[PDB]
Amino acid sequence: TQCRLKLLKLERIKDYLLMEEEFIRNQEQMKPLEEKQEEERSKVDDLRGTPMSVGTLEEIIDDNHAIVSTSVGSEHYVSILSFVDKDLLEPGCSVLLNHKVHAVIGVLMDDTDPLVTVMKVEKAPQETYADIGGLDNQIQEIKESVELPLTHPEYYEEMGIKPPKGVILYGPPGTGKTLLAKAVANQTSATFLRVVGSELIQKYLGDGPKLVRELFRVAEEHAPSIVFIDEIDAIGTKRYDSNSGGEREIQRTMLELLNQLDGFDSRGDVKVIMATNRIETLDPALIRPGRIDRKIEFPLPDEKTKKRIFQIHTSRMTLADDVTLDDLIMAKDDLSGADIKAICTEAGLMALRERRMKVTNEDFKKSKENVLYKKQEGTPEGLYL
Amino acid sequence: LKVQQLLHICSEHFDSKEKEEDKDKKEKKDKDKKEAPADMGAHQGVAVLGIALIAMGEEIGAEMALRTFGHLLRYGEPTLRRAVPLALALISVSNPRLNILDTLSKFSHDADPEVSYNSIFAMGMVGSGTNNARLAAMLRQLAQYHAKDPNNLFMVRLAQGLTHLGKGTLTLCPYHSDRQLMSQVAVAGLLTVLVSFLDVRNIILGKSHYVLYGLVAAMQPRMLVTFDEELRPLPVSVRVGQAVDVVGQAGKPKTITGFQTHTTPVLLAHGERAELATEEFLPVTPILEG
Amino acid sequence: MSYDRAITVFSPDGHLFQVEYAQEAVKKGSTAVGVRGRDIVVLGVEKKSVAKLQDERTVRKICALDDNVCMAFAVVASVSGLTADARIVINRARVECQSHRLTVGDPVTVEYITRYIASLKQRYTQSNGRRPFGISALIVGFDFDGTPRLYQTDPSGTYHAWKANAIGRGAKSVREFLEKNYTDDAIETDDLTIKLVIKALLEVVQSGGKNIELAVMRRDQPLKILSPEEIEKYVAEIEKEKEENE
Amino acid sequence: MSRRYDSRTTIFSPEGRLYQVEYAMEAIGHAGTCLGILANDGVLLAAERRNIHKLLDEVFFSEKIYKLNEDMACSVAGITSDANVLTNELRLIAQRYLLQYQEPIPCEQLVTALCDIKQAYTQFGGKRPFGVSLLYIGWDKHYGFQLYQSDPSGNYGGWKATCIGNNSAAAVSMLKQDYKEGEMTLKSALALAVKVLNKTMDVSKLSAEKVEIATLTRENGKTVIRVLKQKEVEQLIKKHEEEEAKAER
Amino acid sequence: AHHTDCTFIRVSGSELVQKFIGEGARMVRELFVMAREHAPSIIFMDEIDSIGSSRLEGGSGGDSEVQRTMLELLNQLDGFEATKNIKVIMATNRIDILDSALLRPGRIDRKIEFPPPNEEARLDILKIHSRKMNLTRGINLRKIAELMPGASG
Amino acid sequence: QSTYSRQIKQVEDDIQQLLKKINELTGIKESDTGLAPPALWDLAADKQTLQSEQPLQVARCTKIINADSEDPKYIINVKQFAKFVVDLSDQVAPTDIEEGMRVGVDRNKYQIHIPLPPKIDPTVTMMQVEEKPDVTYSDVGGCKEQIEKLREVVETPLLHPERFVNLGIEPPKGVLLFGPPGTGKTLCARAVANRTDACFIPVIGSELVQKYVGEGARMVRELFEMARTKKACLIFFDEIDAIGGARFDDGAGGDNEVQRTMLELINQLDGFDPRGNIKVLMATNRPDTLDPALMRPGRLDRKIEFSLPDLEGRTHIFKIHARSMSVERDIRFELLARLCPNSTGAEIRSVCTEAGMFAIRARRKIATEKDFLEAVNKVIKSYAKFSATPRYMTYN
Amino acid sequence: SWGHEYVRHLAGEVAKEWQELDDAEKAQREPLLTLVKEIVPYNMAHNAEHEACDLLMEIEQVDMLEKDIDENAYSKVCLYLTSCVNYVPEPENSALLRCALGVFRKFSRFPEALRLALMLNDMELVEDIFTSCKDVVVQKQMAFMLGRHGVFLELSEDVEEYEDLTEIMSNVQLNSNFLALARELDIMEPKVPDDIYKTHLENNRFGGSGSQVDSARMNLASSFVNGFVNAAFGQDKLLTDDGNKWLYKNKDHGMLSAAASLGMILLWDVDGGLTQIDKYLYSSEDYIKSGALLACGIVNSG
């Protein structure tokens, strides 16, 4: 709160200084006077023509030649014409090629494709634990598995327990699956990669599986990183069916994801937070415990848990403080965490409809009912049939 | 402070003439030691980016920057342990350069299997696959041994342990040993004191009762940045009152909690990382697991 | 028709579909708590589903089946406040109870009606076309012996005695809550027995204590329904102590 | 669910919670409004008949409001086909009660007898659920004039003002709102009955071809139940009509 | 759209609506970038939920799959969670008949019910239309309004 | 509150402009990497840049037949989907250009400098392939019935092939593996292999999905040829529910590549097949889509239903992990195993991880008995959730 | 509106437009402090005046007992100062510390007062505060212990003796009041701190001795590690006692250093440990003799 506001005063000064400071250091004042430094800048200009073509490096051989696929025309058997060495290079990377003679000038860019641009939401959310509407215990499970081995190896080594390679979140939905993933991701201050599962489904032949493996490669260069696979079930076990080009597609993208996460052992290269809105009616072919160890199940909030979600919320709000928090919760019946959030938002909006500016005790009571009604109409009510 | 702390001209001389303190200075350590709990993380946030700037700016700049950046960790006491420990470790496999192990081990004393996990591996591997001289060997061992000393024993913190808003110990003595080569035989006398220790005491006192191992408190050690650093952090978090000394600087937050036991703190967390002070209405101060 | 659709199929679960499913309904609509006391075994209900233009005499959520055994229920399903399913079960269980008196005298024991009711839902699992009733009743009573008993039945039809048990609005939640309040002192004292019931109800308080209806029943004696007005006297005082624990 | 395990009532729900009943409630809304209001010398029932057509043989005046007994009458909202078995059943129960008890049958007792048959059909016997809500109107000497509401499922409640049919939600709240208690008389409850019936229904005119109105009135201590004939009905409509007309443009 | 001061860009609930460089299922991100730039805008997400029958009952399905992701980016990326300058207007014909993706909390907070016509409504709507189209001889708009209400507008 | 608010508006404009600058901050310089010796290199590079004859394109000969009035031409196909003819700039011979052989040819002469190894498919797949395994029975979840049945296929004919040959039987080498994920199907196959003292190679069908249509069959064929070359080895096919899996003859999806791959695979196996102690295992991770052709007995000799570790086998494997880390001994793990339904070896190891973690939360460095209880509750429920309504399938 | 009501009031004052000398010199600030604590450091920090700190001083001093209790009043001030210092430029920063020192002087709780006296490190300021920490209650209870432990613990010395700038002045005063000679001085001097170190050592566990090899250049390294790891009581006691092995083999300036490093381990001991340091002092070359004095300093900080 106070602390959060203070950090901003330092950051305002920081932007101004950093932009001036950048200039003297980067060059044109630290202009290459060094044999090594000058040689790389001058040589790449001379070899380079314009246009160029991007490629992805398909495999390298140890005799100073490599094989690349360029975006345009055929693949090329290219030589390593100066610059980068063999070690520097790895397959699955994107490298820059001159059209005049396709050769690897280098990478230092952690790839560059249109694919990578979508993947890198790299700059962290402001979202962080206990800025979330969440349950105290539930966030602290996500942190224990994903975050904690990097932060303190101390506890994990003494105890003698094995570090995982990801975790999985599954619903009952409306539990802040995505909110949790964003909270942890800010805390590490490691690069946050994101992709949605449907993007990986396509009606083109073979494109999907390249992207699925690609997520792990991009992340590895950036590493440490946390890779957010939003709605895994989408590539997986939720239908694209068998009559739209799904018949081939789904099985391949699903399988491709499942084998690397599994490996031959739990690899532990880069951490993963996987969010799913259910694994409840969907088919088996997904990652099981003991590669990602802990699998986190959410409940449907009870009276006691509802205290933790609500107290966080009442602070931004007002005039539900007058009335005891305990009594309000008791009164309302059991609902999911998104529903609880929705009541509270709706309280602020309904006052405006009433001709009032913002939440009152009365507005808070009515909002509870409206959401409850939607659910009560949608699915079974009270007393048996 | 921060505004001064980026100010550079280094393309004239590498002496002291126009060269100045600038590459060394770039860490932003003096404040972090002196004042505020929030400031310590924010400046480090600035700092990460600065490593690239020296490194890319000159090849010569990179060599000097790597030594001083490793000291920011010890002098400043950041809540970040992400980028810098690993960075130093990977470069030293590529390029023999003995200074790197030495600056790192001074950080590695603070909490000795958080950061020490990585460092120990790197320092050993390089040590036994590279030696350039007997002199070269001597540095690498010194760092390798200095690095371990399990979990917060005579731990380094630039707190007072009553507050960290105050003036800490003379940090400039490890800063002196880190800037210049530690291979220089003349240096040795000064070199022996570079300690910048903070008590291993976490004894509860501040009232006469004088029991060992203090009250229950709140900590989050699954963090690398935290929600409350206003002055005193969150007093819920996950409970700790263990006998073993506190593991800060990635589980830095301690709030002193004592109201439920009916004693009250005279010392509210002012940046403290040692001894509790309370006014005790009890003859024996409870001790908890957590 | 499909294999899964059919009433016959013992399912990989290892238990019949319609028996399993009736068991997943014993939360939501209405709430029934019963605690055991020396002089009165007391059941209380919250929510009779009354707008207070609706007759409260018509809706029985606390009905005495015998002259020393009474039961209160709750349940989940489609269409709120649903009097019907509960009402057939009251009618067959109460007649059977009166028929038992005629065959083998004096007020019939708590445990026997509870055994009959659990088996009544069970026999249905064999019987044609019939799924079991999803109801859990808190059978509250005194034996002819005068030994107080508090019994509970479940939807499959396995029954257990308890000292104190709570169902509805999340069965598991109300059972857990009731266990903090229960003490061996509570059972001995006549004031505390009522408050113990009310104390479980209140964590889903709705509309006064006039909504909440309690009965005390004694050793051989008919159900005495305490006034909707008396109940209110306990709630005002207790409700404050309640806020503090959760 | 993701698929019902119903398609018979000799097999049951994939949740054990019966969907068919919620569709039945919707069925009352499809059919025309049925309302009952209480009076201090009678009770009256007002129902919208299936027939709106001009050509009516009119031998019956009872085609949704059936007089069962010498103390009670009921109405139908829902499918007409369903009433015919029910109405003959209700006649048997109603006289059955008299034989043993010989008392002015209470409304709560008749309804519980019927609810036994409706709950069994839904549970087993392979018979399709009901789709009618029936409103029972009667007099007993122990509480007075009463009105009860029965649901397809077997769910019952004693009311003194209730409405179902032509969106139930709106209708019950409205019937309550305009209802007053202890201020009433039979003529004014009847004038009001048409007015409320008009608002829930799409028509702003309404006729005795569209509507059928019954009284239950107690005379000389005994209950005389009649379903009224068309000319008598029209007179209650015209009374209402002047007011309805002013609302209109 | 006139009141709110937005550019009405109608947005299909389809995402096979692109074949420009690839399907929409694949290129969910482009729809978003354009939407932002031409802010303020109203993205009218029209999915009537009278398309699909088994899709509605279930949670899975191809249509459900693609639709779910387009909605999830709205939250993750923010700019419908930092702002709401762009309003997502969902349309369905009933309170509940909705597809599982649309229905669930956290992509809903409002549901609005409007009656079908009445004589009084029919008068207003007929009048306004009458003047535009061609008004009748001696006015009999009132007669038609009284007699019976419109099924729709 | 108020004083800050203005700082907020200004800071946003600042951040926008900075996002462009990170590019510059990393370096204005066009360079990647370069040392003083690539200057020497560079003079040579210049000529290669100058001339359009180089760079060398990769092409692949689909078939050898052409040698029409010049030293052998062949049809080599570049990856721009155009066919070209070859000439000598080194040589050309029946052996320099072959059926599978890739070639280096010029952009504007189309002459061969060098042939490259036959096909793209065997070089890439080599990285994925692991060699001889070193894993043992305790690690799979103890001695399981499924383990003993693998011994019969693998151990007996491999160690002593001479008995089966004399008798008049061909030896069995095939198994069909099916069940839910996490059972340890590959783990078990590997376990038996190590004791037997035979090589193991993983092959993943999904890992090679290089297509140009019908291309997929050529990859299947190559993976098989490689296994055959190594005698006294086992080949395990992972992820072959697609490309070498179920057909789609009801389709309306534009596929034929899974069908093409299937066609080639059945045909190679069926009738006879040249093997010599190459065990063929198939693992099908999909119950939903199955390939009947492969699945029935025959050339692939047995079917074993892969089931989760029995009660003794899970107790035994847990014991091994438990001793390593800090645990209280007298362990309540036995009471929990018996209480609970069938639990896999993967599942039990997660218990140990989760129990450690609860223990840290409590603020002990010993993971106690209480901690193991919470850890079993969590694991059993998660495994349990998946459905694909099996009765529905049984009916049809 | 009510929830917001407290913050807006104080949020408005922050601006401090026009008049900067006020009209009241206690400001309207006072009732708001108890209700909201978040708004207040924002006001002092942006204002960045010594005058801002004056207005805050007058109101906290009265508010201490009266409003609620001493304990919450004390808490409110400590938070406020903390935002404010970062914003003030350095010449002016000293002035705000003293102003704060007055609010604390009166207070029952001393902690924050000591930090302010430390920042300055002034002889006079630290003396004034110390005498004030002890005075509130003449019984030892919180008052004396709080003052003694808190001020002394504070660092400014790399050796473990902490400050000791305060130590000489403060001690004569504490023995004069008399709660015992031995109690006041024992806490005040490093002697009590020597015990508490010893007890903690076991739990944390030790990285073993700093010995590696006593031959080659490695003998120099060995020497240096012992000094660096432990400036307190070790578990590497066995190597140091035996001087002849480690200490002598040493070359050049490393000989002086070996002799220094030995003092670090002996620190927290001087009730027998002294004797060897003196042997080293009498004998041999200058490097060793000078080393022994540096080392003595180190031990005689125990």
PDB file of N, CA and C in Angstrom, chain B residues 31 35 138 149-154 160 167 169-170 173 186 188 192 195 197 199 202 206 210 232 264 270 279, chain G residues 71 75 78 82 86 109 111 119 142 153 155 157-158 192 197 200 204-205 207 212 217 228-230 253 257 261:
ATOM      1  N   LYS B  31      22.919   3.483  -0.200  1.00  0.00           N
ATOM      2  CA  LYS B  31      21.620   3.645   0.356  1.00  0.00           C
ATOM      3  C   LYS B  31      21.059   2.386   0.980  1.00  0.00           C
ATOM      4  N   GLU B  35      19.448   2.666   4.566  1.00  0.00           N
ATOM      5  CA  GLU B  35      18.119   3.104   4.871  1.00  0.00           C
ATOM      6  C   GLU B  35      17.055   2.396   4.084  1.00  0.00           C
ATOM      7  N   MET B 138      45.002 -20.705  -4.777  1.00  0.00           N
ATOM      8  CA  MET B 138      44.921 -20.088  -3.448  1.00  0.00           C
ATOM      9  C   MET B 138      43.672 -19.259  -3.298  1.00  0.00           C
ATOM     10  N   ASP B 149      29.021 -22.530   5.425  1.00  0.00           N
ATOM     11  CA  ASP B 149      29.104 -22.470   6.886  1.00  0.00           C
ATOM     12  C   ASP B 149      27.744 -22.510   7.355  1.00  0.00           C
ATOM     13  N   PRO B 150      27.006 -23.609   7.196  1.00  0.00           N
ATOM     14  CA  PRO B 150      25.576 -23.775   7.235  1.00  0.00           C
ATOM     15  C   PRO B 150      24.672 -22.757   7.944  1.00  0.00           C
ATOM     16  N   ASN B 151      23.531 -22.402   7.220  1.00  0.00           N
ATOM     17  CA  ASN B 151      22.354 -21.632   7.590  1.00  0.00           C
ATOM     18  C   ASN B 151      22.384 -20.639   8.672  1.00  0.00           C
ATOM     19  N   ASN B 152      23.013 -19.455   8.380  1.00  0.00           N
ATOM     20  CA  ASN B 152      22.887 -18.254   9.078  1.00  0.00           C
ATOM     21  C   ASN B 152      23.620 -18.211  10.361  1.00  0.00           C
ATOM     22  N   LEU B 153      24.864 -18.723  10.342  1.00  0.00           N
ATOM     23  CA  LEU B 153      25.826 -18.694  11.408  1.00  0.00           C
ATOM     24  C   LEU B 153      26.874 -17.586  11.186  1.00  0.00           C
ATOM     25  N   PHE B 154      26.703 -16.570  12.116  1.00  0.00           N
ATOM     26  CA  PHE B 154      27.470 -15.306  12.185  1.00  0.00           C
ATOM     27  C   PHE B 154      27.164 -14.712  10.842  1.00  0.00           C
ATOM     28  N   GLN B 160      21.245  -3.664  12.150  1.00  0.00           N
ATOM     29  CA  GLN B 160      21.652  -3.421  13.557  1.00  0.00           C
ATOM     30  C   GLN B 160      20.992  -4.551  14.306  1.00  0.00           C
ATOM     31  N   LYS B 167      22.971   3.405  10.715  1.00  0.00           N
ATOM     32  CA  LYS B 167      24.192   3.397   9.941  1.00  0.00           C
ATOM     33  C   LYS B 167      24.744   2.100  10.266  1.00  0.00           C
ATOM     34  N   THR B 169      27.690  -1.249   9.531  1.00  0.00           N
ATOM     35  CA  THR B 169      29.077  -1.423   9.912  1.00  0.00           C
ATOM     36  C   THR B 169      29.873  -0.922   8.742  1.00  0.00           C
ATOM     37  N   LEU B 170      31.226  -0.890   8.873  1.00  0.00           N
ATOM     38  CA  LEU B 170      32.076  -0.424   7.735  1.00  0.00           C
ATOM     39  C   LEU B 170      32.113  -1.519   6.640  1.00  0.00           C
ATOM     40  N   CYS B 173      35.312  -1.856   3.803  1.00  0.00           N
ATOM     41  CA  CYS B 173      36.423  -2.830   3.932  1.00  0.00           C
ATOM     42  C   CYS B 173      36.275  -4.080   3.034  1.00  0.00           C
ATOM     43  N   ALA B 186      50.419  -7.159  -0.807  1.00  0.00           N
ATOM     44  CA  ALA B 186      50.324  -5.989   0.020  1.00  0.00           C
ATOM     45  C   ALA B 186      49.005  -5.784   0.761  1.00  0.00           C
ATOM     46  N   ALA B 188      47.099  -8.106   1.780  1.00  0.00           N
ATOM     47  CA  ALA B 188      46.748  -9.129   2.703  1.00  0.00           C
ATOM     48  C   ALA B 188      46.370  -8.703   4.130  1.00  0.00           C
ATOM     49  N   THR B 192      42.320  -9.380   5.970  1.00  0.00           N
ATOM     50  CA  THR B 192      41.857 -10.234   7.101  1.00  0.00           C
ATOM     51  C   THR B 192      40.542  -9.821   7.799  1.00  0.00           C
ATOM     52  N   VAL B 195      35.004  -8.561   7.443  1.00  0.00           N
ATOM     53  CA  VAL B 195      33.802  -9.046   8.015  1.00  0.00           C
ATOM     54  C   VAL B 195      32.821  -7.944   8.108  1.00  0.00           C
ATOM     55  N   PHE B 197      29.485  -8.616   9.713  1.00  0.00           N
ATOM     56  CA  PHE B 197      28.615  -9.435  10.361  1.00  0.00           C
ATOM     57  C   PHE B 197      27.639  -8.711  11.242  1.00  0.00           C
ATOM     58  N   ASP B 199      24.707 -10.095  14.265  1.00  0.00           N
ATOM     59  CA  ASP B 199      24.597 -11.084  15.328  1.00  0.00           C
ATOM     60  C   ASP B 199      23.874 -12.259  14.928  1.00  0.00           C
ATOM     61  N   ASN B 202      19.282 -14.114  18.370  1.00  0.00           N
ATOM     62  CA  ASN B 202      17.853 -13.833  18.188  1.00  0.00           C
ATOM     63  C   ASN B 202      17.169 -13.967  19.496  1.00  0.00           C
ATOM     64  N   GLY B 206      14.716  -7.207  26.232  1.00  0.00           N
ATOM     65  CA  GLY B 206      14.223  -5.810  26.177  1.00  0.00           C
ATOM     66  C   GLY B 206      13.386  -5.531  27.363  1.00  0.00           C
ATOM     67  N   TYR B 210      14.822 -12.646  30.516  1.00  0.00           N
ATOM     68  CA  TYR B 210      16.035 -13.240  29.849  1.00  0.00           C
ATOM     69  C   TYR B 210      15.906 -14.712  29.503  1.00  0.00           C
ATOM     70  N   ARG B 232       7.001  -2.378   8.532  1.00  0.00           N
ATOM     71  CA  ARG B 232       6.761  -3.586   9.220  1.00  0.00           C
ATOM     72  C   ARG B 232       5.928  -4.448   8.186  1.00  0.00           C
ATOM     73  N   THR B 264       3.485  -7.322  24.853  1.00  0.00           N
ATOM     74  CA  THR B 264       3.348  -6.447  23.717  1.00  0.00           C
ATOM     75  C   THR B 264       4.804  -6.117  23.387  1.00  0.00           C
ATOM     76  N   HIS B 270      11.491  -2.538  12.510  1.00  0.00           N
ATOM     77  CA  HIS B 270      12.073  -1.339  11.988  1.00  0.00           C
ATOM     78  C   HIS B 270      13.195  -1.586  10.972  1.00  0.00           C
ATOM     79  N   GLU B 279       8.023  -5.923  26.118  1.00  0.00           N
ATOM     80  CA  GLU B 279       7.766  -5.710  27.466  1.00  0.00           C
ATOM     81  C   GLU B 279       6.902  -6.887  27.845  1.00  0.00           C
TER      82      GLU B 279
ATOM     83  N   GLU G  71       1.423   2.600  23.504  1.00  0.00           N
ATOM     84  CA  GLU G  71       1.934   1.580  22.596  1.00  0.00           C
ATOM     85  C   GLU G  71       1.561   1.837  21.132  1.00  0.00           C
ATOM     86  N   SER G  75       3.849   3.388  17.752  1.00  0.00           N
ATOM     87  CA  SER G  75       3.875   2.736  16.531  1.00  0.00           C
ATOM     88  C   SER G  75       3.628   3.693  15.326  1.00  0.00           C
ATOM     89  N   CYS G  78       6.790   5.871  14.104  1.00  0.00           N
ATOM     90  CA  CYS G  78       7.927   5.163  13.581  1.00  0.00           C
ATOM     91  C   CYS G  78       7.706   4.955  12.149  1.00  0.00           C
ATOM     92  N   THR G  82       9.875   6.946   8.440  1.00  0.00           N
ATOM     93  CA  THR G  82      10.507   6.081   7.546  1.00  0.00           C
ATOM     94  C   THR G  82      10.292   6.498   6.068  1.00  0.00           C
ATOM     95  N   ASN G  86      13.556   9.509   2.980  1.00  0.00           N
ATOM     96  CA  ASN G  86      14.076   9.255   1.668  1.00  0.00           C
ATOM     97  C   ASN G  86      13.949  10.491   0.793  1.00  0.00           C
ATOM     98  N   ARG G 109       8.717   3.494  25.135  1.00  0.00           N
ATOM     99  CA  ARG G 109       9.511   2.746  24.150  1.00  0.00           C
ATOM    100  C   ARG G 109      10.604   3.545  23.506  1.00  0.00           C
ATOM    101  N   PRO G 111      13.105   2.183  20.886  1.00  0.00           N
ATOM    102  CA  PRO G 111      13.840   1.695  19.719  1.00  0.00           C
ATOM    103  C   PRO G 111      14.278   2.550  18.557  1.00  0.00           C
ATOM    104  N   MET G 119      22.425   7.551  13.393  1.00  0.00           N
ATOM    105  CA  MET G 119      22.617   8.036  12.066  1.00  0.00           C
ATOM    106  C   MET G 119      23.636   9.113  11.945  1.00  0.00           C
ATOM    107  N   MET G 142      11.928  -3.312  31.614  1.00  0.00           N
ATOM    108  CA  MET G 142      12.129  -2.992  30.209  1.00  0.00           C
ATOM    109  C   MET G 142      13.076  -1.904  30.143  1.00  0.00           C
ATOM    110  N   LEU G 153      24.164  -2.740  20.633  1.00  0.00           N
ATOM    111  CA  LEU G 153      24.131  -3.746  19.552  1.00  0.00           C
ATOM    112  C   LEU G 153      24.444  -3.238  18.277  1.00  0.00           C
ATOM    113  N   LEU G 155      25.709  -1.205  14.939  1.00  0.00           N
ATOM    114  CA  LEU G 155      26.996  -1.388  14.338  1.00  0.00           C
ATOM    115  C   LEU G 155      27.524  -0.102  13.849  1.00  0.00           C
ATOM    116  N   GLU G 157      31.361  -0.822  13.872  1.00  0.00           N
ATOM    117  CA  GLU G 157      32.679  -1.518  14.023  1.00  0.00           C
ATOM    118  C   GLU G 157      32.659  -2.866  13.365  1.00  0.00           C
ATOM    119  N   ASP G 158      33.637  -3.280  12.504  1.00  0.00           N
ATOM    120  CA  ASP G 158      33.681  -4.524  11.859  1.00  0.00           C
ATOM    121  C   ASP G 158      33.938  -5.629  12.857  1.00  0.00           C
ATOM    122  N   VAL G 192      28.332 -10.677  27.893  1.00  0.00           N
ATOM    123  CA  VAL G 192      27.063 -11.426  27.674  1.00  0.00           C
ATOM    124  C   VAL G 192      26.933 -11.794  26.261  1.00  0.00           C
ATOM    125  N   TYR G 197      26.287 -16.164  21.527  1.00  0.00           N
ATOM    126  CA  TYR G 197      26.887 -16.706  20.359  1.00  0.00           C
ATOM    127  C   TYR G 197      27.154 -18.199  20.400  1.00  0.00           C
ATOM    128  N   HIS G 200      23.910 -20.628  20.051  1.00  0.00           N
ATOM    129  CA  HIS G 200      23.284 -20.542  18.703  1.00  0.00           C
ATOM    130  C   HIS G 200      24.090 -21.459  17.737  1.00  0.00           C
ATOM    131  N   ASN G 204      22.724 -24.144  14.072  1.00  0.00           N
ATOM    132  CA  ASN G 204      23.076 -23.678  12.739  1.00  0.00           C
ATOM    133  C   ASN G 204      24.053 -24.617  12.076  1.00  0.00           C
ATOM    134  N   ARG G 205      25.058 -25.255  12.837  1.00  0.00           N
ATOM    135  CA  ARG G 205      25.957 -26.186  12.306  1.00  0.00           C
ATOM    136  C   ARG G 205      27.025 -25.404  11.623  1.00  0.00           C
ATOM    137  N   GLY G 207      30.747 -25.429   8.963  1.00  0.00           N
ATOM    138  CA  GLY G 207      31.328 -25.786   7.655  1.00  0.00           C
ATOM    139  C   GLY G 207      32.657 -26.458   7.837  1.00  0.00           C
ATOM    140  N   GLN G 212      42.921 -26.830   4.915  1.00  0.00           N
ATOM    141  CA  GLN G 212      42.847 -27.499   3.634  1.00  0.00           C
ATOM    142  C   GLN G 212      44.085 -28.383   3.484  1.00  0.00           C
ATOM    143  N   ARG G 217      51.130 -22.881  -1.371  1.00  0.00           N
ATOM    144  CA  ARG G 217      50.349 -21.631  -1.263  1.00  0.00           C
ATOM    145  C   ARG G 217      48.993 -21.766  -0.629  1.00  0.00           C
ATOM    146  N   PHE G 228      38.053 -15.243   7.988  1.00  0.00           N
ATOM    147  CA  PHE G 228      36.915 -14.665   7.314  1.00  0.00           C
ATOM    148  C   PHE G 228      35.574 -15.152   7.828  1.00  0.00           C
ATOM    149  N   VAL G 229      35.538 -16.503   7.991  1.00  0.00           N
ATOM    150  CA  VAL G 229      34.302 -17.300   8.491  1.00  0.00           C
ATOM    151  C   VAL G 229      33.939 -16.896   9.878  1.00  0.00           C
ATOM    152  N   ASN G 230      34.901 -16.749  10.827  1.00  0.00           N
ATOM    153  CA  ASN G 230      34.538 -16.546  12.226  1.00  0.00           C
ATOM    154  C   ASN G 230      35.245 -15.469  12.876  1.00  0.00           C
ATOM    155  N   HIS G 253      53.324 -10.944   3.488  1.00  0.00           N
ATOM    156  CA  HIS G 253      52.317 -10.313   4.298  1.00  0.00           C
ATOM    157  C   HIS G 253      51.292 -11.231   4.929  1.00  0.00           C
ATOM    158  N   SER G 257      48.991 -11.598   8.545  1.00  0.00           N
ATOM    159  CA  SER G 257      47.580 -11.959   8.349  1.00  0.00           C
ATOM    160  C   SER G 257      47.164 -13.140   9.042  1.00  0.00           C
ATOM    161  N   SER G 261      44.194 -13.394  12.038  1.00  0.00           N
ATOM    162  CA  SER G 261      43.065 -14.282  11.783  1.00  0.00           C
ATOM    163  C   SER G 261      42.742 -15.213  12.955  1.00  0.00           C
TER     164      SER G 261
END
